[PDB]
Amino acid sequence: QTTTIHISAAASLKDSIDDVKPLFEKANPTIKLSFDFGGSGQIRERVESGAPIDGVLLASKKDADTLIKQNLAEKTKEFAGNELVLIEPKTEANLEQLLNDASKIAIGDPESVPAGAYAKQTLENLNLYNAEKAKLVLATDVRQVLSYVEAGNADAGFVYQTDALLSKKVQVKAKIDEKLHDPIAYYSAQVSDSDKKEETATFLDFMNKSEAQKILEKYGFKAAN
Ligand SMILES: [Ca+2]
Ligand SMILES: [Ca+2]
Ligand SMILES: [Ca+2]
Ligand SMILES: [Ca+2]
């Protein structure tokens, strides 16, 4: 018979998973997928609260290590990478000058969103955090940061390179140097309390196979280092 498993993936994987799901369910007619997308840190809190999730897809090695240490997750596996960029709504201005003219700079919540955590490490390592400290607006996930800059409600925003590629309404004004922050790597894990570990193991391994790896490449994502 059919079996439904629920995966909690990061918000930055919303559009690439849209194409992975039909290819997986075709190759596995007995496993059906249910996805919820949001900030990885908030996905971490729900697993730590007893949420009935089978597997998770997180954009932070820190959030994955946290679930492993509490024996809430198991079998971690990096499957993708990404880069951080500064986007503005649609002059040879530098990053500091872009943040000077900006009145609202949208970043993910550094306490529950990796994209906001990577963006904070960039500003700290550039000696720019305290300068733009009072102008930051925290969001629920990186896709919310994209929605604010798209609508013009925010002057600048920090999103992933894959997020800016999917938007005609914004444009990249600065590519954050990858050394200015911890490596952006996506990880897959299995919630230990899941009753469907066999079925969830099929999908989590499917992400590291050739079919899912090419979807990430064509969507701008990077590979596991
Ligand atoms: Ca300066
Ligand atoms: Ca303010
Ligand atoms: Ca159980
Ligand atoms: Ca079972």
- Spatial separation of the C-alpha atoms in residues 210 and 127, rounded to whole Å: 41
Q: Are 158 and 116 in contact (CB under 8 A)?
A: yes
Q: What are phi and psi of 198, to 5 degrees?
A: -65, -45
Give yes or no for a contact between 98 and 88, defined as CB atoms under 8 angstroms apart. Answer: yes
Please give the single-letter amino acid code of residue 56.
Answer: V
- Is 153 marked as binding a ligand? no
Q: What are phi and psi of 155, to 5 degrees?
A: -80, -35
Q: Which among 47, 209, 41 is positioned nearest to 118, based on CA atoms?
A: 41
Sheet bearing 170-175, strands edge to edge: 136-139, 105-108, 156-160, 84-89, 170-175
User: Could you identify the residue written with the tokens 């897809």?
Assistant: 57
Tell me the longest C-alpha to C-alpha distance in the chain.
60
Token pair in block for residue 141: 């996930």
Alpha-carbon distances, residue 131 vs 102, 105, 128, 153, 154 (angstroms):
12, 12, 5, 21, 17
Ligand nearest to the CA of residue 50, numbered in listed order: 3
In a shared domain, residues 95 and 65: no
Is residue 7 domain-shared with residue 39, that is, in the same domain?
yes
198 known ligand binder:
no
Residue 2 contacts residue 30 (beta carbons within 8 Å): yes
86 lies in the same domain as 176? yes
The reply to whether 16 and 75 lie within a common domain is: yes
Residue 73 near residue 192, CB atoms below 8 Å: yes
Cβ(67)–Cβ(56) below 8 Å: yes
Same domain? For 147 and 216 the reply is no
Number of domains in the chain: 2
SS (H, E, C) the chain: CCEEEEEEEEHHHHHHHHHHHHHHHHHCCCEEEEEEEECHHHHHHHHCCCCCCCEEEECCHHHHHHHHHCCCEEEEEEEEECCEEEEEECCCCCHHHHHHHCCCEEEECCCCCHHHHHHHHHHHHCCCCCCCHHHEEEECCHHHHHHHHHCCCCCEEEEEHHHHHCCCCEEEEEECCHHHCCCCEEEEEEECCCCCHHHHHHHHHHCCCHHHHHHHHHCCCECCC
The answer to whether residues 47 and 56 touch, using CB atoms and an 8 Å cutoff, is: yes
Q: Annotation-wise, does 40 bind a ligand?
A: yes
Same domain, 17 and 99: no
Cβ atoms of residues 78 and 189 within 8 Å: no
Q: Which amino acid is at 118?
A: Y
Give the distance (Å) from ligand 1 centre to CA of residue 122.
Answer: 15
86/174 same-domain check: yes
- For the chain, breaks with the C atom over 2.5 A from the next N come after 90
- On whether both 136 and 91 belong to a single domain, the answer is yes
Candidates 1, 223, 45, 209; CA nearest to 140 is: 45
**Which range marks the domain in which residue 127 is found?**
82-184
Distance (Å, whole) CA 108 – CA 142: 6
User: Of the ligands numbered here, which is closest to the C-alpha atom of 30?
Assistant: 4
> Is 34 annotated as a binding-site member?
no
Residue 96, annotated ligand binder? yes
| Nearest ligand to residue 3 Cα | 4
Q: Based on the domain organization, do 94 and 165 belong to the same domain? A: yes
Alpha-carbon distance 187 to 193, whole Å? 18
Q: Are residues 67 and 12 in the same domain?
A: yes
How wide is the angle at C-alpha 153 spanned by C-alphas 219 and 42, nearest 5°?
60
Same-domain check for residues 47 and 105: no
- Please name the residue that has the structure tokens 């050394």: 179
CB contact at 8 A, 188 and 76 = yes
Asked whether residue 99 falls in the same domain as residue 175, the answer is yes
- Rounded CA separation 110/210 (Å): 33
Closest-CA residue to 3 (of 26, 25, 31): 31
Other beta carbons less than 10 A from residue 170's beta carbon: 21
